[PDB]
């Protein structure tokens, strides 16, 4: 997310045993990175 020119990144990792869908159970994402970049964002694209 973007707030006041900060770009904020949160993350989590877990094992999974259903291939089809995201897990029905609950887990929460701790912060990892926070960048003071001051940039307009309206599009994104992943990289493989």
């Amino acid at each position: 997310k973007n707030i006041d020119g900060y770009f904020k990144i949160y993350s989590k990792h877990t094992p999974i045993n259903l291939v089809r869908d995201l897990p029905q159970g609950f887990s929460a994402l701790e912060p990892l990175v926070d960048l003071p970049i001051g940039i307009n964002i309206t599009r994104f694209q992943t990289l493989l």
Partner: peptide, 24 residues
Amino acid sequence: WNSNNLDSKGNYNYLYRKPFERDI
């Protein structure tokens, strides 16, 4: 502070066009 001894000549290079956003 006034930088009148450093940045004056005149000097025409110094340019003007949400918080902390750089509109380049």
